[PDB]
Each structure stands twice: as C-alpha cells, then as structure tokens.
Design a protein around this ligand. Sequence first.
Ligand code: 73Z
Length: 207
Amino acid sequence: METFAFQAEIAQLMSLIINTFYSNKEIFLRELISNSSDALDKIRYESLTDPSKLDSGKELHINLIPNKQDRTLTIVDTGIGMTKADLINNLGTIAKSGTKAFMEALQAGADISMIGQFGVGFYSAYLVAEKVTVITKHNDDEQYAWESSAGGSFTVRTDTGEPMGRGTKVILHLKEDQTEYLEERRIKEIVKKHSQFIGYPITLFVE
Ligand SMILES: Cc1cn(-c2ccc(C(N)=O)c(NC3CCC(=O)CC3)c2)c2c1C(=O)CC(C)(C)C2
C-alpha cells in the first residue's frame, strides 16, 4: 500500500465538505451516479471504433448496493474505469482547477449542491462517508484500490479482492448518523428525485 498527500486545494475542499453545516447531504448520490454515467458514456463511445474494448464486459449499468451489517453504500458501474495514473495524478490535476472555481462560487453565494458543475462532485461522498474506498479496473491497467478517510492523505494499492472485469466501485463507509442512505425507500426517493433520466439501467439492490 502506497500513501500520498492530497494537494492543498483538494485537502481544503474535503475540509470544507466535512466541516460546513449543510443539511442537503442527499445530493452526494446524484454526483456519484453522474461520475458513473460519464464513465459509461466514455467506454460506450470508445467501443464504437474498437469493439474489443467490451471484451472485459458488454453490460453498461449502475448498481446501488446497501449493506447494513458493514454500514456501506456501494455505487458500482461497468464504465471505463481508472488507471493508476488517474488515481494518483491525472484526476487530482483536473480537481485542482475545479476546486478553485467551486471555492470562488461558494464565496459569491453558490451552494454545496452545485459541486458537480465544477467537476469535483466525487468529494461530495464526504458529506455522508467517514471513509471512501474506490475499487477500479481500466482495460489498460490492473485492478486498484484507492482509499481515504481525509485528514490530508489517500492510499493506492493493487487490489486482491473479487476481480471486476472493468469499471469502478465507490464504497461509502457511512458516518454513524447517515444510515438512512442504507434504507430502500430513501435510496429510491433520491434516485427518482435527482437521477431519473440517467441513460443506463440503475438497479437498487435490497437486503
Ligand atoms: C475528480 C475525481 C473524479 N473521480 C471519479 C470517480 C469515479 C469515476 C467513475 N465512476 O468512473 C470517475 N470516472 C472518470 C474517470 C476519468 C474520465 O475520463 C471520466 C470519468 C471519476 C475521482 C476524482 C478524484 O479526485 C479522486 C478519485 C480519483 C479517487 C475519484
């Protein structure tokens, strides 16, 4: 397992998300589903010129998996996935400019719900999760596990868990007071409110 320091701007973003009083936490789900949808559009687009890009799996879908025993909510997709370079460097570079723009908009009167417009909606996971684990597999790289409980650092390791074929799993280790997001009625309500027209089948798993 390798340990990395978040860039100052992303650490500041995560602290703002964790510390700011903001009751409309439910928007985290649409942000993660939007990232999944963008990932699925990318693999679908690439497959039109190279059909062998779907040898790692033809199905293009999103699964929402609650686990009350583990207190986790997992957002699974069969999108493009992320490489080691994406996890450590590429996406952090993109997140730096988005974070600066989001911070300025917030000072000017914007709301935390607008985070996704700045391309840093992933970090809205910290509205409800004490720890986030990202398991991912891109066609050109190995399966990786990224993880962070904030506090300025994240880890990356090659993942030895169940092989995924292709895609991303975002595992939200929910805060003790955010267990409503494990309830079927609550997830169904949020999906219908904010994610009803996503162009991929969203399956809400139950227990
Ligand atoms: C910004 C940003 C977006 N995302 C993200 C999440 C999930 C997915 C997903 N569910 O795939 C995703 N997909 C992108 C990958 C790059 C691309 O080309 C567009 C889609 C991006 C993440 C970040 C981070 O700074 C931390 C991170 C690399 C662990 C995860």
